[PDB]
Each structure stands twice: as structure tokens, then as C-alpha cells.
Subunit: 331 residues, 4 copies
């Protein structure tokens, strides 16, 4: 073995991230303005725009969930607050029309009662929200929800970063699998635990377990540019979940911050010291202020539409078949 020892499987793969690849142009009859951007969030739910907002207390409360739904995507309400308050944010969203909404739950002792209160409030999607879903307690929660409320509610499980973990969630009955262990902009799991998986390779592996069973993959974390959305979907994901890219919008929670003559908003990991209030796996930081959500979403979808034009992809299902070129450090 060229890199050491006598076991070829010790270093199991070469992991690529978004910056390691570009989409190749292909024969096209598609105008960007005419592409169909709709895609499956879950087995039963299709969104007009393939984007959802992170379940974080500096990204998604009621106002963000309403704006995301109106723009054709969806919000996932965070769970760092009392059960009755999260349930009330669900009703606030449903009171603003027939708008789709999701909400996060954990696997702790209070997680089941939270899930039932969210169901009573009319939630459309429950997200079993963990850092490591390849675990019996998490698989059991997904299965119990699906068997109990699965006719009226779609159940998402995550997060995973390997083929085997994605396969286990499929078997447990997940309606979608969420992919991302380590890639987030505010994540320190890579340096604190030494654990992670570059996202392009993680998506390719998860899709190999999920697509043959008709289960959509949500790419969660590490997306820095509108072009990364196109890359994640071409690797086989059906939607992307965004934190940093939406945290700078007017609709996110938290105050406007002025430093050195420039405007920012606070953005913090749910594993940071501040959010937990210990060995933190996130930081508390800030992102540039970007203006209204509707305008940010227009620009992000605009980049996706351009990629669909260059690759000849009339639908997101066609984009999932596009090819990459791998690039070097120089490029």
C-alpha cells in the first residue's frame, strides 16, 4: 500500500468536495428561463424550487418558513425552544395560507411528545434531526413515526455520510435521507473530533443506496455559492438545505450588526457554546447582510437555471444525470 501499512481498505476512498469539481457543458435545447426547477423533497412532496432552510435558531423561525414556502421552497423550524412555542410557530405559518412547513425533533425523552404536538399543529414534514443517524435509537424513532403518523406526515431522517448509513435509514422507512457529517460553514467537528466526509463523495455514496429505492436525498451543509446547488443536484441529490447562504437575509432571526462600516448578521452553530446554553462542535460567527429572502432565492435559482442551460437539463431529474470534470488546486 503506497500510503502505508498492508491494508488497502484502511484508507477507503478519496473524498471530493464541491470545489474539487465543475459541471461539463453538453448538447442543449434548454433556455435557462424555461427549465423546470421542481423536485422531490420527499417520496410524496414535490417543491417548485429545490431548496429548504436549515433548522437553526439563527436561520428558521416562522417568518423565514413563510417566506421560503411563498418562494416555492420550504422552511424547517428549529427545536431549540419549548415544545408549545415550536408548535405555535407551525400554526402561525399555516395561518398565512396553505403553506408547507417542516419542523425538527431529536431522539431524547421529550422528542416524542414534541412530535405529537407538531402533528396536532398541522406540520407537513417531521425531520429527525441528529449529527449521526446510523444508530438504533435514531432508526427506531424514524420507524415509529412512520408507522404511527406516516399516512398524513412525511418523515425525514439524518444526517449520514456513507452508503451503509443511508441504506439503514431506507430500511427503517425514511421518506427522505439527509446527507452531511462535517461540511457546514460553522462546523468544527472536523477539527474537534477529526471526523467528516467531503460532500460530493458523500452524496454520490448516499444516492447509490437511496435512488434504487425511490428515496430522495437532501444535501445539507457546505454550500457556499449558487453553483454548489447545481453541483449537489448533479451528484444525485434532489434538494439542498442552506444555512449560511440564508442567514444573512432579512427574514432570519437575530439583529443587524455593524462592524467597520459594514453590515452583518449573527450566525451560529447549534453545537456552539451559545446555542447549547461542554465540548462544542460549532462556532458563533457572522455573515454579510444580504437583504430580502425573495431576492436571494431569485439569485440562487438563477444560477441553477444557468447550469441547466449549459448542461441541456430540462428538469432536475435530467440534471441528476450530468457529468463532472475534476479540477486541480491551480484551477
Amino acid at each position: 500500500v503506497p500510503t502505508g501499512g498492508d491494508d488497502p481498505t484502511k484508507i477507503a476512498m478519496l473524498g471530493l468536495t464541491f470545489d474539487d469539481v465543475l459541471l461539463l457543458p453538453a448538447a442543449s435545447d434548454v433556455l435557462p428561463a424555461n427549465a423546470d426547477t421542481s423536485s422531490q423533497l420527499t417520496k410524496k412532496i414535490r417543491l417548485k424550487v429545490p431548496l429548504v432552510s436549515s433548522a437553526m435558531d439563527t436561520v428558521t423561525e416562522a417568518r423565514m418558513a413563510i417566506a421560503m414556502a411563498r418562494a416555492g421552497g420550504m422552511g424547517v423550524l428549529h427545536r431549540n425552544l419549548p415544545v408549545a412555542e415550536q408548535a405555535a410557530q407551525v400554526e402561525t405559518v399555516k395561518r398565512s395560507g396553505g403553506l408547507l412547513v417542516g419542523a425538527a425533533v431529536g431522539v431524547g425523552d421529550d422528542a416524542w411528545e414534541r412530535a405529537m404536538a407538531l402533528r396536532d399543529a398541522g406540520v407537513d414534514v417531521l425531520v429527525v434531526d441528529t449529527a449521526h443517524a446510523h444508530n438504533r435509537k435514531v432508526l427506531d424513532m424514524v420507524h415509529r413515526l412512520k408507522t404511527t403518523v406516516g399516512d398524513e406526515i412525511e418523515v425525514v431522517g439524518g444526517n449520514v455520510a456513507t452508503r451503509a448509513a443511508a441504506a439503514a435509514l431506507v430500511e427503517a422507512g425514511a421518506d427522505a435521507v439527509k446527507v452531511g457529517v462535517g461540511p457546514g460553514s460553522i462546523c468544527t467537528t472536523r477539527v474537534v473530533a477529526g471526523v467528516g466526509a467531503p460532500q460530493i463523495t458523500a452524496i454520490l455514496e448516499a444516492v447509490a443506496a437511496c435512488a434504487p429505492h425511490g428515496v430522495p436525498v437532501i444535501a445539507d451543509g457546505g454550500l457556499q455559492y449558487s453553483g454548489d446547488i447545481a453541483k449537489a443536484l448533479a451528484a444525485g441529490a434532489s434538494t439542498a438545505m442552506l444555512g449560511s447562504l440564508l442567514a444573512g437575509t432579512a427574514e432570519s432571526p437575530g439583529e443587524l450588526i455593524l462592524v467597520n462600516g459594514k453590515q452583518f448578521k449573527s450566525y451560529r452553530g447549534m453545537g456552539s457554546l451559545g446555542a447549547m446554553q461542554l465540548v462544542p462542535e460549532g462556532i458563533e460567527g457572522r455573515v454579510p447582510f444580504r437583504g430580502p429572502l425573495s431576492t436571494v432565492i431569485h439569485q440562487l435559482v438563477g444560477g441553477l437555471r444557468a447550469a441547466m442551460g449549459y448542461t441541456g437539463s430540462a428538469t432536475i431529474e435530467e440534471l441528476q444525470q450530468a457529468q463532472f470534470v475534476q479540477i486541480t488546486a491551480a484551477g
Copy 2:
């Protein structure tokens, strides 16, 4: 598959850019001062110097086209202005002697009338000027021009970055194929759409489709140093098109700018907000002021001549047979 999934073709190639390679020295009888730098721009047109200026409104209007022709190259007049004005710039150039000139046209509804007005003005070369030529509307335009005015005018099509796209332009009747999707200094297509192709690999692939049919390749975008001209031609291109490297010259349009005691000129993408006046795929920037064009061209051709000496290349056709070494990040 070491990088993920079960499909070896998903990541189709490893793409190299100019900074990834160097030309290897070889046995030589050639003095730099005695090399023959002439090369085919198109099937019928041979230039004394293998260089043309970009069709951009901060690079090429009448003054630049006149200076480029006198230096032994050619200018391509931009199309971001009324038809009658572009046609008048063509006549201005022809009034300064028997000087070669080209002009860009699109594929929109007004593109045919623009092309006919340019023909009436005495243009030598028409460039069908798009970001993605692998498309029936673009192929149809190239073919219609060649069948209509092709006896008196040479027709260039572009841009492409794959073997299959280059092959389609050849079949449509192109007299030259222009290569470059994503590499430009002011380009944001890579980050906005996630689309592109590193230029050395793009040129190697396009040449594999074009050279067997006797059709010259124009390398367009990403050239930062005089040494990159030699690299592009050794990869098999016949000429190079330059934007950033000529935008700082006296003959380019736009004002001299003074910031922090240093002189600059404005340089902007044709896909920037300013040029289009939306999801922009270019930026508005600036480049250092470089002085007269004739002097810049002397230095660029001087570097090319040095490469021809080191590689034993008496002509550009011989340089197209030179070999590379691939280098690492450290180098």
C-alpha cells in the same frame, strides 16, 4: 469507484489549466529572433502574429482593431452597440489601409441583419459569439452564414469546451472553432452556475475533433502571461484571443483610473451588470495600465519566440507538436 458511487463515467476526466503544465525543452536549431510566428486564424486566413483581441466593450473598438492589424494580428469588434455604429467602425478600419478586421454577432432576431450590414461594410471575419455553441440555433446560424456569404467571408463559431461540441461546429461548416467556457479573468460562471472546463484539457479535446478536419482552434480566455500563449498553441490551438492582457493598453476603450497612486483602466465582463445595462456571470474590475499596444504585443510575441527557441519549433505547426511536464502545487 474511488471517488464515490458505482459509475466510472460520472467524473469523466481530470481537467488541467495553464498553471498545471510547463513546456519541456528539446533539441533545437532555432534562434528566437528567426522563428516564424505566422499561423491560421481560419481555414483561409493566416496571420503574421497568432493573436486576436476579445470582442468586449472595454477591449476592442476601431482603434484597437487598427493597431492589432498593424501589429500582424486582428481585432474582433464588440456587438454591444447599434448595428449602424458597429458597421461604421468596420469602415473606419478599412479606411486605414488594407487591414483585416472581424466583428461579433449573436443568434437573436436582430443577428442576421447585423451580419448583413457588417458584410456590406467589408468585414473579413464574422464571429458567432455565444457562451454555449452546442445548440441547434447556434449551429444553424453558422451554417446559414457559411452557405450565404461563405465565399467572401470566413465564419468562426464558439464557444465550446468539449470534443463533441467542437465536432458539431465542424459539421455545421465552421472555418474556425473558439474554445473557452468558464476560464476568463472576469468570469463568474464557475461560481454562479458551477460550470466550466480547465483550458489545457478543453483545448486538447477540441483539437482532437478539429485538427483531423483541418479546422483551426482559437484559445479564448484564461491567458495571464505571455508563457500561456506558448502553452495554448502547444496544446494544439492555432491562435489565442486576449482580453485582460490587452485591456490595459492605450488603444482600448475607457478612461485611465488613478487609485492609491497607481494607474489602472476599467475592464468588465460582457455578462456583468454594467455591460448588460438579472443574474450576472461576469464582474466589473480593473487592470494595471500597460502603455501602447505595439509595445505589449512586442513583449508577448517575445515570450512566444523564446518558447520556440527552447522547444526547437521553427514554425507554429512545429510548436503544436511540443511536449509538457505536469507540475504540482509546490512547483
Copy 3:
């Protein structure tokens, strides 16, 4: 041979460092709080926490050795002082309870008398402390110690960075093998001599010689983050030795330094000019002040515990079987 010459063995391997790899998540029944972090320092000695402090005069004297033992690890007392003084630091530690302690010795003419004085003082571990253990004088010292005092004292030999060197120490009778030639934060051997071996590959190679003989490997140098501890142990090491990461603690020797409104402590190589008082192979630098040792160790072990959770490793022996993904520059 693609990289030059006709000998495939001239460039013998591709060496990976900690930053080149991440640990992959795996199926897990393990909670971080419930993992067993105990591990073999030597054939006979098992520590509660798999960490020891460097034998350096800005890292480990009596106070550090006492604090390390109380936290469940061990200190190795430096040898840059008179024999009678080092022996007295050993007794100081033993006077603070039944605490484990080690001490460094060289291979010079005074090394044997130093070793005997340390034995008389009640030392638990002798570390034969060199930059290059693949040498007859060093192997002879290890063997002579083991045959003379080996029933009551465990003998460590180092440092090495190849399979063959580790194998030689095993044959000589070492109770543990210490790995690291070139990787230290304050090391200049790589630039002064041009010699070294990236640590992940060095650990994989040393373990291939040591594990089949039941001899533990100590990973020494280059560890910058708590996550690097998990990586070193997963590559097959049984403990890690830390210099820079503990030099900023209250218990290390040396004064608090204030520069630009920030607090630091001095940290210097044992091969720096200052420590030797010549061709130095270390620098004299500084590290940020970090507070009490007990608190730093809590955070480091916290990161290790997180890695054990993500990888499903109930013990350090299970962690030694975990898998890596290799990452690129971009990642």
C-alpha cells in the same frame, strides 16, 4: 517511472499527514460519555487517558508530571538538567501519592548513571530519548536497560519513522516504540536536513512492525488539534505525546508573556540554540496561554470521546480499527 529515472523504489511511498485524512462515521451504539478511553502506554502499563506530555524544558517538570498523572495520563521529565536534579523531580512526584512518572535519558557517556539514579528514585518508565533510534548504540542501550532493570521498569525507545526501524527496537526488547522524525511544531529538521516522514504514514508503517509483537506505539509530534489524537490512534497508535498543545498551560515551566495585548508562553525545541546553550534543528517560539492543564485535557479527551461516538468505537482497541477518507487541498 512517471516522476523520473528508471528506479521505481527511489520514491518509496506517498506520505500522508494528519490534515490529509478524516475519520469516516460508522454504525454506533456508543455514547461519547460512555466510551472507555483507557489504553496501553507500554506492554505492562495501561493509562486511564491515552496522553503523555513531551520531555521538553518548556513542557514537563514536576508540576506538569503530577497534573498529568492526576488527569489519568503521564508526564515524561526532560533531561536538560543535572542528574541529581532530575532524580529529585521524580521523588517530588512520588511524594504526591501513588502517581506514575517517566523520565528521559540519552545514549551519551553519562546516560547510564542518569538511568540508575532515576531507578533509585522510583521512576516507572525510562524513555531512551533520541532523534534517530535506528542505530546500534541506541538499540544497545534499550537492550541493556531491559536486561538490567526490566522487571521493575518499563523501557521506551525512539524516535523512528519506518517499519524497519520499529522492527529493530522490538527485537532489542522495547516495551513501547515512539514514532516521529520531523513532524514537531517547533521542528526545522525538514528544512535544515531535508529529512522527515509524514506522521499518518509513519504510524501505519511502525504499527505494521509493532502490533504483531504486542508492542504499543506512541505517536510523538505534529498533533495540532484534539481531532489529531483520534486520527493517530485510528492509524494504530496506542497513545499520543503532546508538546505544543500542553506548553500553553499553567503547569508548564516558563513565564507568562504579554505581546500586543495577548497572553503567551514560551515554547522551544530541545534542538534550538537556546536549549543547547552549532546547527540547530528547532526554533524558539511561543504559544497562546490556555489556562489550567486539567481543563485543556478535558477538552482534548472530549474530542476523542466524540470521535469514538461517530465511529462506533467502545474502546481504544476498537478505534484502532476505524477507517479513513483521504481529502484534497480544497477540502
Copy 4:
């Protein structure tokens, strides 16, 4: 072909530079202080220290040549001055004892008379001094010198960077071959012409042609640290030529410069505008002031001695058999 086109030989090799490799430690009986650092400069001439100074007008005139010889190496006098003046510097050196000295000559019309005047002055080594020796005029000059004055004078030819070019100089009768096209610290050939060859690979290739014929290789350019000397010799070179590393010494030509409270000396390429007084292939820069030559040489040889200890190399001939590990960007 993964990187483009259909020709596997177009990208002929992967080129490594000094920063891409480290020397692996090996079994050793060698103390650094006891290593034998002597090595062949040419077929007949052996130096006590394997180092020579560059033929540059900011590195080597009489004073530097005298100091280099006394330190056990040799100086090569530059040729950017009148013939009678260069010949007088040779006699100045010979007047300071029985000291070895070399001098550069070109291949222009005045080169033969320069060579004869240097011979009359008592020069020991003539260096045919070009940027590209794979050329009939250069090969003819080497052969004519060897056949005319070869009994009393050793003849060096260079520079080359390929196996075939080195082989041609051997056939022409060279007593040593000098390797380096593009690597120098003040070189811009890589960016101006796009031509070069990373030095480790260039040395491995040149040695494959020269060592079977008993002809020594001089590694010229790109050496930045004392450790790079050990790397060049392990790749198979017999000596190293130094420019930047000796330009900062008291004995080099040119004035002490004070900028921002720090001391520097001027250092310029022989292809810079200033030296030629045009398309320059070098820059005019500065290096930190380093003090007396004897002290710099002591430190450089000290690093070499350390490498010989780590690798078990008793002589330079043994060091030429040492092995490398290739490292990544991270390392």
C-alpha cells in the same frame, strides 16, 4: 487519456521539485561530524565540500572565488565584463595560493578568445554557460574545448533538464553536466516562455544519462534551504551550484541596502534588464544580508552532515543511493 486528447505522450511526465519530497531515515552508523562530504565536481576534480557559487555579477567575482576555495568548494567567475578583466580576476585568485577556480564563457563570436585568455591565466575549469545546451553550436564548443585544452582544463557544459540533452553533452565530451532550466529564484522563464522542468525530476533524468558514463551532475538553481542540498545529491547530483543562498554574504559584489530597518543586498538575474544593459527572463531583487561566507557555508554543510547521519550515508556516493517519500500540499 484522462487529462485530454488521445496521445499518452503529450504530457510526458509528472515533475517533482525539492518541496515535493523528503529524505527517509535509514539504519545508520554515521555521526554527522564524521561523515565525508567530499565529491566530484568533474571527472578529474574532487572538492572537499560539494558546493560551487553561481556565475553571476551579484554573486561571484575574485573575493567570492577565493573564499569558496578556502572553504573547500569553488567559485565560477561571471562573464559580464571585458575579457582582460575576467582573466585578471583569475590571476588574482591564483595569487592567493594554490586555489581552484572556474570561469564562464558563452558560444558567441568572442567566446573562443575569452576561453583562451582564461587558459593563459591558469583557470582550472571552463564552464560553457548557456540557458539551453541541447544545440549544435553549444555541443561543438564543448567538444572543441575538450579536444584543444582538455588535458589541462576540465570542461563543464549546461544547462539541461532532460535525459536526451544530458546524453548529447556526454557524447560531446563534457567533464560534467549542469542541470537547471527554469528553477532559479530570480527566474521568470517559466512565466515569460512557459518553459521549465521541476528540479528533482530533471536531476533524476539527467543522472540516468550521465552516471552510466561516469560523468558528474551539477544541480543548478532552485535551492532555498540547506536541506535542498541533501535532496539534490540524493537524487543523484554530485555537487550543487548556489545563487540566492550566497548572494547575501559579505564576499558577494554589490552594496549593503537598508530598507524598513532591515539589511539586504541586491541580487539580479543575468537575464534581467539591468544585467543585459529586449525580453527579460530574470528579475532584479534583493536578499537578506547573511554575514561572512565562511559562516554561511558552515551552516549549509552542517545541514548536509545531519542528513548523512539520518540516512546512514558515510560518503556522498552513499547519499546518492538514499530514498525519498513524496509529500502532499498539506505537509
